[PDB]
């Protein structure tokens, strides 16, 4: 088919000529995705490496490990390499620290080396003899000549004075000449000590200790913390990495969009306590300084907090006595520190005054080897005297490290400071309360000062239950701020990451829940068993693989379809508007009649809507690739997906093309239907994806839903990279989901196909032009019988006929639109047998409506309409040139059809009506409405196309038929009357009009006996004379007589006229306002009850929106309710929990494993119904083994792999592409776990003798991928078993009896002494036993599960309890359960819940406002409908001033708004929506609802003036109101949430700026009501309560007052928006190129009501009986004068407006003067839907009262009881005009301005209307006519006037006016008549060829000479018949504006 090319070219021409929709459709979606590009740039993707978190020691695993662990893991570091904790045997990570390295260097060189054994003897020598001390050493010394003392054998002295030739003289005794033992070879462990101090352990002293030694505190606290970590922690890789857990999606609204988030109620200051009075100082310094205001707030409950137990029963006291294991040893530590107070005074006694200190001073000569000390300088740092060093520098003397100064003083100061700090602790934390209700109030009291840890309430035990049940159950009641919420157990939004923030998500560790829980369970276990065998807990979080968390992935999954829909919404609207407009102009019917099929039209529309769509999609894909938003998916499959979406939406537009007939309405409605069809994808995405049937084709019947599913799959793929590559486009992609991206696109294409097919099916049957439901396919033209018509080849055969009397059906049969067959209508020599071909190519037609496109130029209109049935384009140029030459419109070749003149449009349509060489042509009213000059132009065009064509024109103008062409054909409901020329059909007589009565009538009677005065009208006289056998006396002798006698008689005019064709055609066939507002109210009531698309659509749609809002708000559960969780591992779904059995050599560990995995099951599910009341436990115990995977799994791991990386790693490809999880290969973690077994529900894996980390971190991606199906609530099928076994590598070697060694050191001293040190040392072995635990167990927990670390503590402690008990009391009955029940919230805690609820309240308030705003939009639509379509100024002139009109419209608006308000309040009254139905709150709500309309309707009213389309105003107002309300509520709500100078602006806009808007007032009213209700509910169960009476006069009352004042001021504004006479003359001189003494007479001038001289200086007025016709050319449209005279509108004063309505000028009295001149409303102002009562409403404006007459007054009309009962919108073309002109004359007004009194009416009705007009002018009621048809202005206008170029030209009666500005027709050889017309008559004109029907016009008054030669001498000139007619008034009018 070739029509597709031309149709596509036409569509492209329209698209290019629009130039406004094309540019925006191409540019604006790019701008929309620029938002996505900006969001991608702003929101980055977080990428991070592998994590291996260290251990988290528990209080049951010693004090030292737990304390150093809580100090080390303050950040919970992420470590790439696995920590030593994950290893099977070793469990302590802190063996790389400086202290650990020092302790490893020691205990190796010194203790564990067989070198100190010898020195032990010297150490234990002591040799401290108490009796042989204290200056008691004297000996007799009787030895002589020898020593060991001094010889005493001499007569002079012994040793001193006898040192010369005598006895002993020196240390060695000698009588002749003067002169055990060695400890450790005089050196002991010298080289060992030197080596030990020369190790890297010097870094402990000379590198890191030196900053601490200098001053108290080296520098800022960060460096001190780092130094302490280096000493204690010693973590590798420096400071550990962090994940920062960037996920706020769990509440925390203040920190996301409210700016800075305020903390909790911070304490004021240290307001006294029982502490040291120094601890208060540091507490104040920490809780007031912002640096530590956060850390101390999270540390005060632990150091200074209380734990409360409810039962107070002896069992509870016994349990807690076994639970204070850590505190009873922290007290021991504190006592040990405090023992310094007594030790120090005795240690310092060794320097000031001590005998021991003197020994080293006295040992310098020979004791302790030689003079050198350290074995004669054994080491470089050794030796020196040491008597002037840190060893001693005298008891008191004045140096870098001399004496015990700089060591003892600093040590004492540090120890005293440590004792003071440690005294700032509370260890009697356990407080004994009862009944569990004092617990809650005391916790509430303590939480103000943060001195409250928790409360351990025990269910089901009375205060008198000394014994302990086999199943001991207990609860922990934490504060909700520092405990995980118990209402949600999962994150509810899976984000790739380990969820390991130090402070944001580990509320179970730093909050103290886990520590207290473990202490309580340890107490319970040790009370129920009491068999020692201590086993702690070393909770270790599961490793996490390297991940790339992209925060943008949340977007583009719920925002990409939003943007796509909002991007093609305007294209959808524009294309639907174009399609509907192509049918509204009745142009699709024209195309179908021309020959092109419907399928071709659909195909070309698809091509037009697809070319621009493809261009836009190409631009969008280029932008997306350039925007770096979809970087990995594909460059091309995205383009294919968008093309599929485009064709789907084009098919949907084709579907929505139906159900519509108006372009604007369809354009407005499609733009919202296309989004409503996209809503249920959002509905399924929001809390509905979990409930899926694996085949969403049923719900994806809408294309946007399919696009949403496809983009969801694209998002889910983009996380792993390669989103939509061809390799995995479909074939069960996305973790084996049945629904596929490829399948989704294919079914969307099928959806487009079915939409197109259904659109075809509907369009074949829905339009009213034609239909066929359920088709179930399986001499040129002449008519002998069809009745007898033979259209001649060169005649304009006017096919006249009455409406519905064969004038339409016969044409429809002949044109082939409805071929009846069985006839002899041989059109052009061809029959009906084949009318599709060779007929339409030469049967160009023209319907009544125009067939010109709005936007095509005339240079292309004829081109398209000639090539539609043409073949080539070269001939098309010649045809266009010929058509332009004929039409004479060559100058206006580039002007579009819309810009063409009104009269030129019809001329062009007739020109293109028959252009493809149409031999036979059909015309339907070629000149229905045109200017007479344009009528003559189009007639000249038609007469130039008669060379070979046989044009057939069916005109309702009988006057036009006689002048268009010969051979008229009138059909009188059957057959043919007479197919002859009008001259031969006129005589199927001659009426001469002569314009005193007695003198005028005397001439007619005297000179003729058959002369009769037909009508003696005013200023007229119509004389009737016979036509047949009239001789010469009655032919023109009267004209000779009238001309002979014309000076005496006035007349001044004369003429002869023939019989008009109109006759021939018919021959064949106050106290007034109260009664006006009532009428307007009745009209409104009738209109609103006779329209189901305006009343119900405005009282139900808001109700539906409010119901949807209520449904959305109700389903939201309360946010402030926190239930209690049983805290067992089965709270989640089916899961894998592993099982490592390490340290097999311990029988206790073997029995623990056996009673963990086999006998009582994994967990707590006892033999009785416990720990799982609703979870039954089955009996499977399969003990299976995984089958081999010989693909590569049984082979790749079958090679030799060392201890390192036993698995073949996996691809952490986060280098060039962000793949999030590594997506590890088939190797994964290696061989599968040896067994899978389940007892209750969970699969158990025996990870024994197998690497745990290499499996846990590597098989996790596979499990999560297999489990991730919705990404909302996904169970990763694993949370972490517990690894039985593991020894704490560091254990105190000394153990017990260390005090005995310490006592021996203090034995020879006062180092022993003091009451405090005895108390500290009496129970030291228990302290050392509890310092660390030898055998220990590890626990693995997945922190992504919220309640996992707690639950696995519970299962581990249950196992420990079941293992420690002896070989009796079977463990199947023994268990412990914890229940986390947080405390009830406080004011500040519930403030967040109040804000969260107020958010939903504001959302529902916005929905209610948007729903309620529709009614004012409907009122505006009605106002525009009755404004632009007239009937506005019609009611103005016929009614009271606009003030009362607007008042009654306001009253009706209130009446129609009250019902909707009642519906809304009645849908709120059900279910008690947010307690809006309360007796105190309901009046406020109903008042707000009622007053919102009163306040917003006056703002809706002015929108009528701005908007002219009565359909675009609805959307442009609803969207505007929605935007205003949303903006107002958002500004007034989100800004209300931190004193950052925005609160002043917020208050200003709340008080003065935004208070004006009623939408803001209603929003504030509902928001404040919701807040008040929430506060009342909060205070209800707190016992406070308050009144909070509505109408606060400052909170919600101000909104009501604002609405009340706004309604009045805006009504005044609407009234204001709706809100000269120099000289005049009575003289009339326009007749030749003095008062008012007549009825309905005017004596005034006139001036234009504009800035240009439109109508100035008009005539005076009209006589009582005078139908003054205000005619004129289209240049002077008379609108500027008609509007000024009546109807107001453009009735501005201008320069000199002085015209009056016969009683007063139209200055300051137009309203009073408007009661005399009812306009005829040439715009067909029947804008209502009232039947038989529309005239009842229009009959108002009665002088005093007509209520008893209005029934009969409506009866007087133009033949009532015909269409009166029919609906006003169901009237025919002329019926509405007849009704309008009947209304225009109801009160017999003196002056009537009948503008276009009839239009498109059959002559049978035009004659009746003219009869009514003459009847009403007979009495004296003047009328005014301005119709373009000269037939009406000649048969009705007694006087006539024509205005040209802005001024009138001529006046007077029609006959006298035509005389200043008589054609004889003869019917027969033109030889004798031509000679007679040139020999007898000197003047003549053309003879109109020799067609035997010639028309002769004489330019002279010698009518007498045309009688004898014409009638009497007819045979002399061979004339069969003759007739004389004067020139038509149309010639005179054309002559003026020629
Ligand atoms: C768990 O063990 C700790 C170990 O101390 C208990 O701590 C309590 O500590 C306070 C102060 O250190 C003791 O108060 C003292 O009472 C004596 C009189 O008995 C008085 O003379 C002192 O001046 C001081 O006020 C308190 O006695 C002590 N508790 C016990 C039971 O001895 C903690 O109470 C233990 N918890 C449980 C639940 O048993
Ligand atoms: C805090 O909330 C708890 C919820 O369990 C309240 O305890 C019960 O609250 C309900 C109301 O929903 C009452 O009907 C019960 O009587 C309460 N229990 C008891 C034993 O009285 C608790 O009262 C609340 N505390 C407050 C509001 O201070
Ligand atoms: C911890 O374990 C042993 C204990 O001596 C030793 O290899 C070293 O101190 C540490 N090993 C590490 C950190 O790999
Ligand atoms: C400790 O240091 C102080 C401060 O200089 C000093 O006065 C004192 O002598 C030193 N030695 C002591 C207190 O034994
Ligand atoms: C121990 O202290 C007491 C009193 O403080 C004192 O008398 C005694 O001498 C001291 N010990 C020695 C060895 O001096």
Author numbering: 4 to 151, 158 to 188, 271 to 489, 494 to 873, 929 to 936, 949 to 1150, 1154 to 1160, 1204 to 1277, ...
Could you give the paper's own sentences about this structure?
Human ABCA4 is a 2273 amino acid full transporter organized in two nonidentical tandem halves with each half containing a transmembrane domain (TMD) consisting of six membrane-spanning segments, a nucleotide-binding domain (NBD), and a large glycosylated exocytoplasmic domain (ECD) between the first and second membrane-spanning segments. Unlike other ABCA transporters and other characterized eukaryotic ABC transporters that function as exporters, ABCA4 is an importer translocating either the all-trans or 11-cis isomers of N-Ret-PE from the lumen to the cytoplasmic leaflet of disc membranes.
ABCA4 exhibits a highly elongated shape with a length of 230 Å, a width of 85 Å, and domain organization as previously reported for other ABCA transporters. TMD1 and TMD2, each consisting of six transmembrane segments (TM), display an outward-facing conformation as found for ABCA1. Density corresponding to a lipid is lodged between TM1/2/11 at the level of the cytoplasmic leaflet of the membrane. This feature, also found in the ABCA1 structure, most likely represents a structural lipid important for stabilizing the protein. In our structure, we resolved five disulfide bonds, three within ECD1 (C54-C81, C75-C324, C370-C519), one in ECD2 (C1488-C1502) and one connecting ECD1 with ECD2 (C641-C1490) as inferred from an earlier biochemical study. Eight asparagine residues post-translationally modified with N-linked glycosylation are evident with four in ECD1 (N98, N415, N444, N504) and four in ECD2 (N1469, N1529, N1588, N1662) in agreement with earlier biochemical techniques. The substrate-free structure determined here is highly similar to that described in this recent study although different detergents were employed in the purification of the protein.
